[PDB]
Amino acid sequence: MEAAHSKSTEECLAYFGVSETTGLTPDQVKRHLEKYGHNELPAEEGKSLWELVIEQFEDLLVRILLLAACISFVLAWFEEGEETITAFVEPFVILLILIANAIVGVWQERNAENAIEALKEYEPEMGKVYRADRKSVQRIKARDIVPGDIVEVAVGDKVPADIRILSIKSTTLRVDQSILTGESVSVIKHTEPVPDPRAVNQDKKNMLFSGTNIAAGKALGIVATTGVSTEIGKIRDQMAATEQDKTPLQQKLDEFGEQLSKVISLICVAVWLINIGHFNDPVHGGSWIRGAIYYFKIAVALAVAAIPEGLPAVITTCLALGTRRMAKKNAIVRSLPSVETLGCTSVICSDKTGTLTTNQMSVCKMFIIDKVDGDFCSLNEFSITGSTYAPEGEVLKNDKPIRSGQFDGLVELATICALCNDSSLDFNETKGVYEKVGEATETALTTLVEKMNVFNTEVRNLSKVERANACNSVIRQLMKKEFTLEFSRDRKSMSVYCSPAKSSRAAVGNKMFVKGAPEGVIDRCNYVRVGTTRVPMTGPVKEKILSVIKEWGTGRDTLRCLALATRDTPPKREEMVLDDSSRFMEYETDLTFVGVVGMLDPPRKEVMGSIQLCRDAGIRVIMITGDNKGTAIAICRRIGIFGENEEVADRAYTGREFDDLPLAEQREACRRACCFARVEPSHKSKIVEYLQSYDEITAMTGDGVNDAPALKKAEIGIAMGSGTAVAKTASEMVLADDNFSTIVAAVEEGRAIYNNMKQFIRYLISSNVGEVVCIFLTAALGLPEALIPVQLLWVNLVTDGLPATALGFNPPDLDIMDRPPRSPKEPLISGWLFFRYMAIGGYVGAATVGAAAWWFMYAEDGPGVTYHQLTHFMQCTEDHPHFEGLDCEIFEAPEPMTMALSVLVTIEMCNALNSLSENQSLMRMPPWVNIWLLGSICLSMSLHFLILYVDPLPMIFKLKALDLTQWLMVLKISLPVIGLDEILKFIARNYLEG
Ligand code: BEF
Ligand SMILES: [Mg+2]
Numbered sequence: 001m002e003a004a005h006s007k008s009t010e011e012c013l014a015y016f017g018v019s020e021t022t023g024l025t026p027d028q029v030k031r032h033l034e035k036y037g038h039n040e041l042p043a044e045e046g047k048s049l050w051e052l053v054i055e056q057f058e059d060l061l062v063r064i065l066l067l068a069a070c071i072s073f074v075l076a077w078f079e080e081g082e083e084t085i086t087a088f089v090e091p092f093v094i095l096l097i098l099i100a101n102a103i104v105g106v107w108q109e110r111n112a113e114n115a116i117e118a119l120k121e122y123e124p125e126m127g128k129v130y131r132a133d134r135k136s137v138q139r140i141k142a143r144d145i146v147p148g149d150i151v152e153v154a155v156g157d158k159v160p161a162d163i164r165i166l167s168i169k170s171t172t173l174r175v176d177q178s179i180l181t182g183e184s185v186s187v188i189k190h191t192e193p194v195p196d197p198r199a200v201n202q203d204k205k206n207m208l209f210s211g212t213n214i215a216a217g218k219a220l221g222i223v224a225t226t227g228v229s230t231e232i233g234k235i236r237d238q239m240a241a242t243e244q245d246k247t248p249l250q251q252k253l254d255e256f257g258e259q260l261s262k263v264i265s266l267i268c269v270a271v272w273l274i275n276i277g278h279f280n281d282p283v284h285g286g287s288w289i290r291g292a293i294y295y296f297k298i299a300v301a302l303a304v305a306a307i308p309e310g311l312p313a314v315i316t317t318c319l320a321l322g323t324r325r326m327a328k329k330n331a332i333v334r335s336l337p338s339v340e341t342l343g344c345t346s347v348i349c350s351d352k353t354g355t356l357t358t359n360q361m362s363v364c365k366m367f368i369i370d371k372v373d374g375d376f377c378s379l380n381e382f383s384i385t386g387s388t389y390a391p392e393g394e395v396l397k398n399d400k401p402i403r404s405g406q407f408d409g410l411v412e413l414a415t416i417c418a419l420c421n422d423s424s425l426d427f428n429e430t431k432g433v434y435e436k437v438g439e440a441t442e443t444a445l446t447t448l449v450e451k452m453n454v455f456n457t458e459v460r461n462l463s464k465v466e467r468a469n470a471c472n473s474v475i476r477q478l479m480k481k482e483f484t485l486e487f488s489r490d491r492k493s494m495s496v497y498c499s500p501a502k503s504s505r506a507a508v509g510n511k512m513f514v515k516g517a518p519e520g521v522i523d524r525c526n527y528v529r530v531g532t533t534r535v536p537m538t539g540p541v542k543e544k545i546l547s548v549i550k551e552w553g554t555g556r557d558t559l560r561c562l563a564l565a566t567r568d569t570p571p572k573r574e575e576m577v578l579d580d581s582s583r584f585m586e587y588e589t590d591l592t593f594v595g596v597v598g599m600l601d602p603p604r605k606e607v608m609g610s611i612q613l614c615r616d617a618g619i620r621v622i623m624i625t626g627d628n629k630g631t632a633i634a635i636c637r638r639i640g641i642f643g644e645n646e647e648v649a650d651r652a653y654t655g656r657e658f659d660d661l662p663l664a665e666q667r668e669a670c671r672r673a674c675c676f677a678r679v680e681p682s683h684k685s686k687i688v689e690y691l692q693s694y695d696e697i698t699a700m701t702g703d704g705v706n707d708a709p710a711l712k713k714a715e716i717g718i719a720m721g722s723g724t725a726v727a728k729t730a731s732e733m734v735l736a737d738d739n740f741s742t743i744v745a746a747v748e749e750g751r752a753i754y755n756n757m758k759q760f761i762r763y764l765i766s767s768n769v770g771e772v773v774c775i776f777l778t779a780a781l782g783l784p785e786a787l788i789p790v791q792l793l794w795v796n797l798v799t800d801g802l803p804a805t806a807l808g809f810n811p812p813d814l815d816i817m818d819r820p821p822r823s824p825k826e827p828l829i830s831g832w833l834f835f836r837y838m839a840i841g842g843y844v845g846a847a848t849v850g851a852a853a854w855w856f857m858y859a860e861d862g863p864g865v866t867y868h869q870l871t872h873f874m875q876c877t878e879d880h881p882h883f884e885g886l887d888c889e890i891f892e893a894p895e896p897m898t899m900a901l902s903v904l905v906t907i908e909m910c911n912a913l914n915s916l917s918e919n920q921s922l923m924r925m926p927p928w929v930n931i932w933l934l935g936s937i938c939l940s941m942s943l944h945f946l947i948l949y950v951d952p953l954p955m956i957f958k959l960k961a962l963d964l965t966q967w968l969m970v971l972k973i974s975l976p977v978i979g980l981d982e983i984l985k986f987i988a989r990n991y992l993e994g
Pocket of ligand 2: 181182354355702703
């Protein structure tokens with residue numbers, strides 16, 4: 001029955017034809033279950049173990065590589081017994097690596113869900129209903145609840161389903177809807193209809209929403225909706241309906257598919273130059289039945305010599321490394337790519353109630369009278385530290401710790417706070433934290449009392465559980481609580497009637513301790529307490545009291561104030577009627593004012609500092625909350641989003657004010673304003689979307705259901721460890737610690753990972769250029785193959801492997817943060833780096849066939865072949881007489897290729913040291929700035945000597961150990977590449993912007 005809120009109680013009962021006194025009959029339940037299904041969200045947690053792998057391979061580059069594998073498959077398939085002892089190994093290698101990444105990534109996803117399953121479904125969901133079945137209330141599975149059911153809820157209960165309040169058993173009912181509405185202070189409900197059919201959740205004051213919890217009171221109601229029809233249900237679907245388009249860095253890799261797919265065409269161009277050369281000569285000794293087995297062979301030859309086949313692993317490795325580091329800070333990163341992505345973020349949108357704030361009401365300011373003398377009235381003002389329910393903090397006066405017990409006024413203040421209170425505080429040994437019991441604004445008084453410790457009770461040797469009520473317990477022993485006059489909306493105050501307890505003070509008599517909205521309570525005070533004595537309430541005294549209440553009620557503070565007083569000579573129980581709250585106000589008159597306490601939903605400790613760091617990092621921080629604007633702004637001032645006295649005319653908007661703006665203005669407003677309050681969940685999503693329309697990598701931070709859609713739409717969703725399950729599933733990262741500053745650390749790391757990431761891409765690909773420049777020089781130009789496929793593979797893969805991951809330990813500069821986030825569209829590899837790795841790329845060419853072929857021509861132990869009899873080596877087993885040498889097989893000798901490979905390797909080791917800095921000379925930025933890199937080169941080099949000695953290896957890799965004379969030639973051929981780049985860099989720093 002949607003719209004139940006607009007209908008009356010009888011209407012809702014009639015609608016389902018159920019008795020309010022007995023509940024549904026077991027026959028109706030069976031029928032309603034049939035017509036409405038069970039109470040519950042559509043079992044979540046999609047994407048199976050299979051789904052993951054599926055999309056894993058759906059990467060452009062893995063695809064390119066895998067496709068390569070199909071083409072190379074027919075090549076290794078079309079190869080005769082010449083070097084096919086391991087030439088067909090290739091496909092297995094590639095394929096293995098493929099599954100090698102599918103396995104890892106998928107591993108991380110499942111893993112994630114696990115850390116993300118932190119006590120969250122550990123506790124079974126129950127619901128209390130009355131059914132014709134029996135007279136007593138029944139505790140059943142919440143999933144078995146159906147619309148029409150009669151439900152009962154009480155303090156501490158989690159509302160099982162969307163319910164229409166029928167009858168309130170307590171004087172009043174209070175609900176904390178923060179987990180859904182972001183509403184700071186609990187909402188007091190009523191049973192009358194809410195006419196406006198368009199009333200938002202904050203207006204449905206006669207409804208209880210599934211997922212929320214009862215702050216105070218007891219009530220009976222009728223279930224309106226369940227499953228996906230509930231407010232929380234709607235949001236889950238809304239959220240699910242939002243699309244996750246793509247990934248910020250993944251997009252970069254999707255983008256590198258360009259540089260390679262493009263070579264696909266580039267090779268076609270180089271090849272086109274020889275194909276036509278044969279459509280001129282009349283030969284019929286093998287058409288499309290025989291002759292052609294060479295044309296398609298080189299296409300993959302250079303292909304694989306094109307794809308820097310390490311990189312997908314290297315990326316996973318370094319990235320994952322960043323993951324772990326984040327984790328050392330309690331940074332659960334549910335996804336590997338966002339790791340770096342949070343770095344690129346230009347904007348951080350953060351929720352209020354539950355994320356930027358702790359969500360626990362806390363008393364921090366208070367005052368009693370100091371002295372009264374005529375028109376003079378001075379107050380004793382104190383401040384209180386601590387921003388949670390924990391009994392940890394201090395009372396200060398003029399910023400210095402004092403002993404509250406030395407102020408008689410505070411002893412009575414603490415006493416009123418402890419006695420005039422229907423709630424308490426507790427320690428959840430399971431969650432390991434303190435929790436309120438009953439109303440937040442009352443628990444705040446409880447913990448205040450535990451901090452004050454006015455009787456200096458011993459608390460150092462106590463357990464967390466005992467510490468929670470130590471001081472309060474002491475005070476509860478001084479007076480017997482006869483009864484309490486519960487809070488009423490007209491009077492706006494609460495009081496308790498107490499009689500003397502311990503015989504220590506029996507000459508005291510009965511007392512009434514009162515608290516409530518300042519104006520009404522102070523107006524009912526005829527006296528003011530000063531220490532232990534009392535003076536009459538005078539205009540000058542009242543003025544001073546009200547002026548400080550006023551200050552605390554707005555401006556920098558904007559605290560919720562409560563006035564505390566006591567009735568020294570209360571009526572006799574007999575002369576008091578306690579069944580009608582309409583009489584209470586009169587009993588709470590002729591009172592003695594004692595003091596005032598100021599409280600509010602505190603910002604988390606580290607938020608202010610965090611927002612300042614982001615500022616310096618050029619990252620904006622925008623508050624987007626469902627709470628009222630007054631509170632939104634107040635918290636913005638406390639954390640620094642707004643100046644203490646700044647005017648926020650057009651920098652803070654309500655949901656409505658925002659909507660009253662033309663789309664264009666709305667969009668613009670997201671770039672200017674930093675506080676959006678009283679907004680709906682779609683509002684949050686909308687704001688993020690606007691930000692993204694300016695090509696800004698945006699992050700969202702939340703805890704409640706109303707954050708879920710925005711969290712998902714943001715490039716990086718960040719959920720509070722103590723937040724809802726929804727918010728977490730919709731996030732890439734979870735602050736298990738609730739430490740807001742971890743976000744900044746994540747940005748910092750997400751940044752270091754990155755830079756060093758484009759790095760191992762530089763150095764790595766280097767080989768492919770040098771690699772095909774040689775194949776092209778020997779195919780369409782001359783000399784035999786200087787290097788082969790299953791030769792260059794071990795290079796790219798292991799030879800260049802450890803060094804890359806090595807770049808993961810690459811030391812970030814000490815100024816990586818104190819600088820703005822990089823361009824959204826910025827390419828990556830280009831301009832002066834394309835040429836930087838192209839030049840170096842094409843150098844290795846003149847170094848391979850060069851220092852290698854060198855063996856063929858001038859190598860003291862090589863043939864001594866002439867230049868073009870080498871560029872025509874193909875015509876050896878026929879036009880032999882033209883160049884009568886010795887054995888037409890020396891052209892397929894391992895020595896030349898080994899000479900070439902060894903040059904590739906040595907050159908890459910050096911370029912590893914170079915790629916250290918984009919434009920910094922190796923003299924300015926020494927190669928020992930990265931110890932891992934030095935060790936990786938050692939490891940790669942010794943792995944080279946391994947492939948050249950251990951019999952099995954040199955056999956399957958078409959090589960042969962070079963001579964010291966040949967190595968020295970390799971060095972003279974390779975080393976100078978450092979000189980070339982050491983020069984190109986210089987030209988970049990001096991005569992260029994570098
Ligand atoms: F809960 Be958030 F402040 F919207
Ligand atoms: Mg919230």
